[PDB]
C-alpha cells in the first residue's frame, strides 16, 4: 500500500537498499557431482536466508498475507537465485560466478548428468544481459517483478504496474527514446520467460538429486523444493 505512494526514484533506492549481499563459497575446483552440488547447496541455503529478508523489503510484499508471501517465495526462489547468478556472471563471459571464489565454466558442468544443459542456458542469459548492457537499477526491478509475478495465479497488479513505471523511468533517465524504451522493456521481460524455464528445469534436477540422496539438502531447501514437487 505504501508501495504505490512511492516515486520512481524512491522505488529504485528502496530496491537497491534491500539488495542481498554477494556471499562466498567454501575455500579446490569442483568436478565431481558430490563436490559441485555440495558447494552449490550450501551456498543457495545461505543465499535463501538473505532472499527472505530481501523480499520483506520489496515494497508491497509485506502488505500481503503471510500465506501469500510464503507462496510467492516458494514459487520464485530458484528464479531469483538464478537471475542473481546470471547478473553477477555478466563480466565473466563463458563462466558462472556462483561466488567471487567460485567461478564455474562449462567443463565442470560436463559431469553430473543433466547439468550442462541448464548451465548453457544460464550462460546464454548472462551473455544476453551483457549485450543489452543491463544496469543494476534495472536488475533489481526485474528481480522484484519475478517475486511478485511468478506465483500471482489486484494489489500485486498495481505494484507490478508501479515497477513497470520504475523500469521505464530508468530507461528515460538514461536518455532512451520512447521507442527504445518500450523495445528495451519488452526485451527485458521476455528474458523472464527463459528464467522461468531454467528454474523449472533446475527444479526437476534438484528433485533428481534429492531422491538419489547423494548430497544432503538442508531442511529449508527440502521444503522449498517439495513446494514444487
Amino acid at each position: 500500500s505504501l508501495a504505490l505512494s512511492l516515486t520512481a526514484d524512491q522505488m529504485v533506492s528502496a530496491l537497491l537498499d534491500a539488495e542481498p549481499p554477494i556471499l562466498y563459497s567454501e575455500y579446490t575446483r569442483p568436478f565431481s557431482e558430490a563436490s559441485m552440488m555440495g558447494l552449490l547447496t550450501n551456498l543457495a541455503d545461505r543465499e535463501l536466508v538473505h532472499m527472505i529478508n530481501w523480499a520483506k523489503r520489496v515494497p508491497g510484499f509485506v502488505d500481503l498475507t503471510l500465506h501469500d508471501q510464503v507462496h510467492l517465495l516458494e514459487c520464485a526462489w530458484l528464479e531469483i537465485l538464478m537471475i542473481g547468478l546470471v547478473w553477477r556472471s555478466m563480466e565473466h563471459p563463458g563462466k558462472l560466478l556462483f561466488a567471487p571464489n567460485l567461478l564455474l565454466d562449462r567443463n565442470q558442468g560436463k559431469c553430473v548428468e543433466g547439468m550442462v544443459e541448464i548451465f548453457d542456458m544460464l550462460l546464454a542469459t548472462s551473455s544476453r544481459f551483457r549485450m543489452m548492457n543491463l544496469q543494476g537499477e534495472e536488475f533489481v526491478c526485474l528481480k522484484s517483478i519475478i517475486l511478485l509475478n511468478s506465483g500471482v495465479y489486484d494489489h500485486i497488479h498495481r505494484v507490478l504496474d508501479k515497477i513497470t513505471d520504475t523500469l521505464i523511468h530508468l530507461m528515460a533517465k538514461a536518455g532512451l527514446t520512447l521507442q527504445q524504451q518500450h523495445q528495451r522493456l519488452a526485451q527485458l521481460l521476455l528474458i523472464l520467460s527463459h528464467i522461468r524455464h531454467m528454474s523449472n528445469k533446475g527444479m526437476e534436477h534438484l528433485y533428481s538429486m534429492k531422491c538419489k540422496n547423494v548430497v544432503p539438502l538442508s531442511d529449508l531447501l527440502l521444503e522449498m523444493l517439495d513446494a514444487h514437487r
Binding site: V49, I52, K56, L66, Q69, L73, D219, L220, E223, M224
Partner: peptide, 10 residues
C-alpha cells in the same frame, strides 16, 4: 508448519 513461516517474521 513451514520453516518459511518462521523466517518471514521477526
Amino acid at each position: 508448519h513451514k520453516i518459511l513461516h518462521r523466517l518471514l517474521q521477526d
